[PDB]
RNA sequence: AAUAGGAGUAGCUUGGGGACAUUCGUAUUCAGAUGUCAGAGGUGAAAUUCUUAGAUUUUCUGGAGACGAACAACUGCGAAAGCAUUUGUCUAAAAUACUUCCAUUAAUCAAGAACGAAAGUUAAGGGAGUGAAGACGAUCAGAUACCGUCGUAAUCUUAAC
RNA sequence: CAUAUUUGGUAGGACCCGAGAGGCUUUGAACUAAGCGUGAUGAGAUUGAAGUCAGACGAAAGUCUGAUGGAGGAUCGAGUUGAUACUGACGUGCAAAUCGUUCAUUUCAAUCACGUUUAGGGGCGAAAGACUAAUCGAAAAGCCUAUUAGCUGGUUAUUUUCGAAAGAUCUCUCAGGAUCGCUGGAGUUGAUUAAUAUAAUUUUACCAGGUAGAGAUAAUGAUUAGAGGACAGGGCCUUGACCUAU
RNA sequence: ACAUCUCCCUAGUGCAGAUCUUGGUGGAAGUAGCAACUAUUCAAAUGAGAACUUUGAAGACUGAAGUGGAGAAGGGUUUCUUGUCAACUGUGAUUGAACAAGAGUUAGCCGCUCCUAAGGGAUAGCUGAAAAGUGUUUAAAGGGGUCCCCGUCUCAAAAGGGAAACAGGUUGAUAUUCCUGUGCCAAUAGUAUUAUGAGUUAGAUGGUAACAUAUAUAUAAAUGAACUCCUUUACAUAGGCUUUACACUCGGGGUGCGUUUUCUUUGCACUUUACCUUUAUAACAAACCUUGGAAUCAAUUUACUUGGAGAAGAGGUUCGUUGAACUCAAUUCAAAAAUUUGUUUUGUAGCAAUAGUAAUUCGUAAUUAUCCGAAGUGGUAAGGACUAUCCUUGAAAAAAGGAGGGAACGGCUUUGUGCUUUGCUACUCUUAAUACUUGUAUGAGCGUACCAACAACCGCAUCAGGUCUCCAAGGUUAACAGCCUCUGGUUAAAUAGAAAAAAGUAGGUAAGGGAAGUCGGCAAAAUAGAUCCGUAACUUCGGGAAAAGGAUUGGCUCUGAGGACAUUAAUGUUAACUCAGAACUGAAACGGACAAGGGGAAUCCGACUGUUUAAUUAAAACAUAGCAUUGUGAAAAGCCACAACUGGUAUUAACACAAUGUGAUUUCUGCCCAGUGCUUUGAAUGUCAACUUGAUGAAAUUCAAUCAAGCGCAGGUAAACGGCGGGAGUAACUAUGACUCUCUUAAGGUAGCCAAAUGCCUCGUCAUCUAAUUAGUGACGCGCAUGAAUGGAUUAACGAGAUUCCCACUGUCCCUACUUGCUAUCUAGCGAAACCACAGCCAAGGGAACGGGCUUGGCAAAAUCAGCGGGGAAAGAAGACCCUGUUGAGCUUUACUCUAGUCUGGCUUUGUGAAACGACUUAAGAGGUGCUACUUUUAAAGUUGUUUUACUUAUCCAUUUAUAGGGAUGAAUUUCCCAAUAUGGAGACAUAGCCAGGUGGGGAGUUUGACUGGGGCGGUACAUCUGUUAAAUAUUAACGCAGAUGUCCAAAGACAAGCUCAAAGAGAACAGAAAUCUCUUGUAGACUAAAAGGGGAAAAGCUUGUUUGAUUUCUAUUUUCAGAACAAGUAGAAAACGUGAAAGCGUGGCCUAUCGAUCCUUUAUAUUUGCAAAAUGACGUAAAUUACUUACUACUGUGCAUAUAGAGGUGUCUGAAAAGUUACCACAGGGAUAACUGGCUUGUGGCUGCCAAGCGCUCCUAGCGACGUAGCUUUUUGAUCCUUCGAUGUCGGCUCUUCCUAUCAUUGGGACGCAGAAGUCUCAAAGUGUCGGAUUGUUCACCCGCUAAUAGGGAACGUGAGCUGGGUUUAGACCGUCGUGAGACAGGUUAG
């Protein structure tokens, strides 16, 4: 046929991210001597909204460590933090909400966010609204630490990786149902052109593997192999099992 | 100043009364190790089941939910439903004692209201064990049952009913 | 052997005209599609969500009544944006989609402008194989290319002479081809001696036949009747079978 | 200029045709036609000539959503004046957007020009043959300060940001642009003078505060560096409220004009004021401050907001609106201070009247007079203060400004090395002017006409089409609607007049009936505005709802209700429009025009609003929220793009991203993992590639062996694809079967549901609706073939949806009639085309089977005019249906062949060590065997292969401005201990390179027999063999007939010998019909491998003996036939044998069937050959000498190849390696070939006979009539395939006419089982007639009703340039069954 709808989405034309009103990337204060050997205290001056994600962004001011005057970063906000709060970052920073600490210095069973998947990477796991990770353990020789990502996997990271004490802001976002189509339109309008979806089975054959027939029947298995080639990947990708959940 | 009533005051008064935080124990189970070697589970009898890719069994680590025995009674508290690990915090409660205060403030109550086991419902988590449904193996003239093996929903917390 | 011409055969454009395509390289997003940026735009009405105030009731919890209020991809509606119905007008049009009347749409999944993004087995698609400049189940342009066609049409002065076939075998063969048959030309040989060769002929000899016919009492198969006799059931007798001549 | 025929060379050499090409031209024809957009008339001028040039007068229209002003894109001199008429200006034309000749566009301020956005193009790298693809991914890169700090370049807005301009006047054509006035903005160098004010003896003051302060021709001037920190620039949507401006209106004064018979203190016009002056002030919403200290809370807005974190009150300060408001300023006099308050006069506040406008006079340019006192409506626009909405929070920079910070700091004279010490006091700022030098020392370049559609654009053009923005008057009014009017514009459209008919088309209107019409209430009509009442089922409680259903409504004349101000409760001045009530009045009418809901009762589908097939389908399709599912923890991942490097999702991170299914709510979501998918474990495990490793060999080779994934083996999975049974028997009647038996499945349809868009049978059965019901609805449900996210069931709301009924209503219909505009018509003017072999009266006949011409008849008389649709198998256009092609294409798959990707192993890149493991080599013991060979253990020897690990320098990822060596909601700038590759991370694994296996409709290329009484299905008649058809040689056909073939056989072959069989009779213990035995009779009735036919008795049969000729080689030939091939034979020959005594006979089967080219492989054969300059037995045998010696020998390495001979197979059998689909389709053809008529025939249907056994009470025939038998007919259905495939428009209804008779009625008769009556059969009869409906797409059918009877037929199945389009037969769609799929359906249903 021709290039299928899934393939077209990737290809860097019109489907590029809806940039225009985004306020710039959220990534933690980069690693330095002052943080590594101690603590630096900063000021949250403002909390600002973001067209991409449910969590609000937090406007954080530091005073520079080798030049005069104040420099501004954008941190992703923990729930329960506030404008005019002092935010502290570093190895000696105290365990308190919205501070930024190495995971090696957590007491067990703390709830955290902004994990760096490997050290110094400025935060890359646990950023969506209402998520958290839990610290589950410290090895006897130290150096590594064991954490739990909110999907349900357990993961082991280096101890000196950063995280932020407290749950990610804007919790419960998908509790509220989207009542009408226009609200869904507005949700996708600030994200990515990906919607309305269009059922693949209703397409002509030329456009998609489910297409054709006279009852909109799938007509062959809905589970396709991990090994499947590019245009073939159709319904339930590489699935372990199908039908309703148990645990 | 009612062996009426309410209120007060007092005691290292009382108690598995309520709530929240908190903490520990054990089995069971999962995972990770460990050593073994043929059967192990299962029963009125057995089979379905699980097992040489090492089951069952041995001991250890880590995880997980559940429950909180024994002590425990012709015992305690709660309006009743109900309530049993540790400590803390917030709460109520009754009796006693009282040369303390108020002075009939009461009794029962259609209307109306608060709470209201268990199951069930709705929603999020959660999901060990148990286990309507269901699936088989048996038992029986027959068995949609009793018995057996597995096994969803429910059982647990939060938020509603 | 060389060479002249001829015809046939074979390759090429190869008797002339004719696809549907396939490949190669480019050119289009002024329409239109979707995305984006900067911007514009939507007469007038109607309903009357939350909150608020006042009144009323009740011991309580609570509940009612009147205002106020101004919510909603709410309602009707010009415009605007559409195209439902009239199978109305026109249908050698006013137009290669127009006209009249009717109708759907109007603060949002809204409409428009301009700028901008994505390009051909590609783009784009709230998905019709829709759309990508009157061109789309594979755009437009030129070239490979006079592509190729067992198929259709056409295929040009005269007189004269001879003149067919529509059988046959083989064929991924049944609209074709090959190859035999049947035809013309060229030539030699022979006849040219009322001849021998010879003949779609008869004759006299001599064979070979199993069709029309004819037969059932000749065989095989059918097939309708009785007559006369020496193996079976019942009570010399009955049904027969079975013979024999019919 | 031309011949050549004397002879002969040479060729792009001879046309009617090709839907030929090109150019020209007719009939059609003075015809079709010149129809939108309300509509013109009279007089005059110009001119040769005026319906459409100009002018006046009328009458009209556009009607501020305009043919009005401006502008954008595009056009491009279209503008203007002057000419002017060859062509054009579809009529005319003196006109003109035509033609000709000149002419016209003026900017510091309006734009562009500058900035950045979505984005573009480049630089660094890196890829790539290059072309190009990428845009910091290994940058020594553009600037600012004065050695330090910033830091990709560049383009991208004529509607975002944006230095500054307005008024009046003026030209034939421009004007925010020229002219006049007034300003504003930006520059404005150095040096020296001057003048302006500041500060000083290096930085002013006030104010409690919020904050204020420079008024100089000019508000100029209030120190400030590095470095910083802000802010303005700069932003959504909704809703109301409020303020100002403009607009509109009213009243009064003043001017002019108008009506002025009658009325009219009148109707109308005019009554002007810009930028600019931080505009001066006032006013007002806020904000903020000082005081003040608040509950019986207060203040307070339309709205709610606000307060001990300080409210009210009282006094202030500021911004923003505004832009002369306010006694504002100036002035005056009265009362003040060593410069105020009170009173007066001025000024359109300056700009400003000199400028405008309306007037009025005189010259023929000059004067005069006017220019202003009150107020309302709220239509526009801006602002202000706000409130609410969002799983949406609503650009950026250029540019400018403010602050923090505190670097730097008299002038002159002078010793000494910018510094130090001495002497002296106007110095430092700062505007503006001036002079001089310095290149010439003030304002760059580009745009500016006109149209902007009605004729300037695009649409082939002066095309009723399309095309962006602003401006918005009066009345009516909810109203920017519709109607009419003012300003402004027009009175022209590709023509006019006259006539007035059919027909057409855009309209009206109809008595009585009221859907009877029609597939269908389509069309048309009815309704409608408002106020006041009244408002159901049902409902997700929100709605349904304007439900339904009523009433009222004019004009006049009154009444009541609703405010604002200011006087000292009363008294006064004073504003709107909206409401409510009462009289009187009239042809009972009054939302009067315009505007403007039909409603109800139900079913089906879709929840909804949304969206879609541009130019046939708006929907039930699609989307949607919710539900449900799946992958993925990250740059060595998911998902996806790219040749490659590299990207995108990602400015991201599981409440995410990606991929699907389903489709609001409510209620539910059963069963099955066998089949196919998908998926999880592995060195026990079968297979499974390269490499490796060993063994063998002279080597090539040849052999083995090893832990890849994959599959297999073991599980998991159905909101994965999907799937979800059959018979019997059984209850006091019968019935049914709870109940039982039974075969069987992976499991056997549960909850539900229904003749539903799902039901074939089927118009199902029963109700009900109706008068009549294939329709509607409710039931019932052994259901061709319902059913649970492929969703089941129900649903309020919603629908340009599908369907039915009921009410209202009507010309839909009875049944049509009248009427109006515009056409048609005639004329003047202008003026095409399709089409066209030739043509054009018929009947019949024949003929390629329906002729205009042909034969025989009828017949046949110019020229014309208007209609019309019978025919011209009328036109269009190489049938789209069907078939055909060794033409295609789209699409699908477990078709054949592949392939990007992906997964996995190996080798490399790939270093450094450590340890463990194994193998191999060399030595010793134990076990078995025949000085030798084999098996098992031991060396822990050497060498080598492997698994685990440590290291980092290779390599890879991340990070930053590459920013301190490791341990113990202010401001912030000029320790101690240990040590002596930017930082982490990962790391010889990746990755990448090359091999190699798997996976691989994601994507590619291609194929997808033939015959064929259409094709497909079925079959094989495709290779063959018998008999028959075949017509007495031979020949010879059909999807003719009855059949057979793809083998079987060491004997069933070969030879000889012996014997005679089947059967029948008569006999013989057990013994019977069969058993064996015997005798007689026994020409074949047996047996002969197998079809069927031939042949066979001292055999060809049966029994027995001996055997292998079922052999090798070669001919001549027969059959089919081309007299090719194979195959099967027949006759021999040369060998060798077998048997028989011997002749003989034996070269497969008693004869007729039993089957296979080339290449290739494979194994046989040989004293045959090759491997391309040579050799390989063998220095063999003799000699010979010491050597490059001489003779002489059929037999001479491995491997490969030949030649000859078999065998491996092509059954579509003289031999391609090959599946489906198209209702999305294309093209070449076909009447060689279907679906339609006509034609032949008439099986089938229909109609008529003849017989006479019977029936008819008795009685053949009154009426009948079996058993039988003969015809007719072409209204049926077939059979057929002659005609048409470069198109005969495919069902039915409507309408309309004619023909027929096989008569239904009517007329006349005859017969009777005929009493009358009723009637049956029958003859002349085609004159005349043959109906209203219900239901269905219907032919047909069935009712119901009328009737005189509701007869049968024909005419290309009469009737589509008459209609209609409901059905069938395009594209969309739904459901079932069927198909893995694409898709299929003589099944249904819907838009077409």
UniProtKB/TrEMBL annotation:
Q: Which residues form the Large ribosomal subunit protein uL2 C-terminal domain?
A: 95-230
Q: Which residues bind Mg(2+)?
A: 197
| Pfam families reported for this sequence | Ribosomal_L2_C, Ribosomal_L2_N
Q: Molecular function terms in GO for this entry?
A: RNA binding; structural constituent of ribosome
**In the record, which residues are listed under signal peptide?**
none
Per the record, the similarity remark reads:
Belongs to the universal ribosomal protein uL2 family.
Q: Which InterPro entries match?
A: NA-bd_OB-fold, Rib_uL2_dom2, Ribosomal_uL2, Ribosomal_uL2_arc_euk, Ribosomal_uL2_C, Ribosomal_uL2_CS, Ribosomal_uL2_dom3, Ribosomal_uL2_RNA-bd_dom
What NCBIfam families does the record tag this protein with?
PRK09612.1
- One GO cellular component term: cytosolic large ribosomal subunit
Residue intervals of the Large ribosomal subunit protein uL2 RNA-binding domain: 10-89
Q: Which domain of life is it from?
A: Eukaryota
Q: Which UniProt keywords apply?
A: Metal-binding, Ribonucleoprotein, Ribosomal protein
The protein in question is named 60S ribosomal protein L2
Q: Where is this region: Disordered?
A: 1-19
Mention one GO biological process in which this protein takes part, according to its record: translation
